[model samples]
Target: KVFGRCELAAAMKRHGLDNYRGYSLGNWVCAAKFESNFNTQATNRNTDGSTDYGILQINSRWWCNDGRTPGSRNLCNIPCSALLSSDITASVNCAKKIVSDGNGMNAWVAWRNRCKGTDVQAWIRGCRL
Candidate 1:
């Protein structure tokens, strides 16, 4: 399912990402916009044989078990398929775990290149979150 902009923001906020780990809601909004365009089923296979899954594009190498990622830690202890759900609670929980694990939002290259070091407020403006 592809979410509307404010829909995604409200969902994330409801799931406790409003100010998670000092990263504002807008940061997550912007990152998800770039990472998956709010598409819950988005997936990308990296060159290193790892796959990124779900709206946040959480990687298989450390976050989810894809059963094929070489040396995967599966730190989130979740199947990669779980991240594809439009329900988003599992994705939100794993994202929190990723930040709590000290990687911060920089764990996503999309966040690093697009949402970092910039004003992300525009991403959430008028979202009513």
Candidate 2:
């Protein structure tokens, strides 16, 4: 419940997330919406015991350590719970690193399944940024 679409766009721009790693802000917005609806505390568990964490739904199997998932590479070297906070600086920073690693927004299945091949521009509709 951390955002309305417009507010999210504004906040994201304020956080300097627009055009991150050459992907449009709308893509990030769409990713966050489908991933967690902007809810910072959102968590989804996979059948393999890995979990998706926080607003970006970053997977525990690779990005962050949640303690339950095994064999985590922890490229971000952060505790997964850090992403599940009211402040999103850590989440956004981690996502930036993930995108910069060359996957673009593909790190998020939600982006591919829902936002990809669509007019993602609407994700930022009515926002000044």
Candidate 3:
């Protein structure tokens, strides 16, 4: 598992995810909170047989492959397991692509369902990052 909100923010800023692709770091963190609870190895199998992978929960049907599961396309060009690692590099990279390819941060369901139209700035309150 990864750190919670403040720690997540610090690490995100360290990883340079702040304001990436015109989205605030707070929004990303909020989305991750609801999506995977900051757990690196977190995964959920959807009812459709597709799987969500890693902290950002990129879908197997759209983003990365599990090497055995077929996706719409492997846009990240890496196995889904790579996103389960503690390092944020590949996961963050793929997340960036997802945002760029989709409708900004709306690509993430958590963002649309929770973070959107909310005062997301308070999500990072008191974080020294």
Candidate 4:
């Protein structure tokens, strides 16, 4: 399936996020835009020779073991791009479980604070597109 800007916004809204209200969403969108321009099927090769796949820029080997059997994997053990594909909500939920837990949005929080120079929530509100 293909996801455009509107679809992504809807997906974020479905997760109870405004996307225009939180830095996490901004960071995610910025990453997605930079990494893949929001293309769900985007892929790249890491310097280590591993492959990063999907809109979320998840590593193929890290998530799919080279797309061997399932062609996807979950975050229960390691990070996987398939998580973003199977279900954006589930992937975010898993990210919260494994990466963020209850800390405060994990990577989103960090990305916003360090890269955007603001909180995730604030950044989202300030984002233009």
lDDT of each: 0.91, 0.87, 0.86, 0.50
lDDT of 2 by residue, 1-129 (tens): 477788877877877788988878898889999999989899999999999988899989889988888777788889999999877788888898899887778889999999988988889888776
| Lowest lDDT block of 10, candidate 2 | 1-10
Over 7-120, each residue of candidate 1 has an lDDT whose tens digit, in order, gives 999999999898989999999989999999999999998899999999999999888998998778888888999999989999999999998887788888999999899999
Against the true structure, candidate 3 reaches a TM-score of: 0.93
| TM-score, candidate number 2 | 0.92
Question: Model 4: how large is the Cα RMSD against the reference?
Answer: 5.9
What tens-digit string does per-residue lDDT give for candidate 3 at 15-81? 8789998889899889889999999888998887788998889988878877646546688988899
**CA error at residue 13 for candidate 4, angstroms:** 2.3
Report per-prediction Cα RMSD to one decimal.
Answer: 1.0, 1.3, 1.3, 5.9
lDDT of 2 at 116: 89
Worst 10 residues of 1 by lDDT: 120-129
Candidate 4 lDDT over 9-118, as tens digits, reads 55665674443234356556555555556666676766666666555555544234454424445444544555446356544444444334344434343343454654
Q: Which regions of candidate 4 are displaced past 4 Å?
A: 16-23, 60-64, 67-74, 77-87, 97-115, 118-129
Scored by TM-score, the top model is 1
Task: Return model 1's CA RMSD, one decimal.
Answer: 1.0
Ranking by lDDT: 1, 2, 3, 4
When sorted by TM-score, best at the front, the candidate numbers are 1, 3, 2, 4
Question: Of models 1 and 2, which has the larger TM-score?
Answer: 1
Q: lDDT of candidate 2 vs native?
A: 0.87
- Give the top-scoring candidate (lDDT): 1
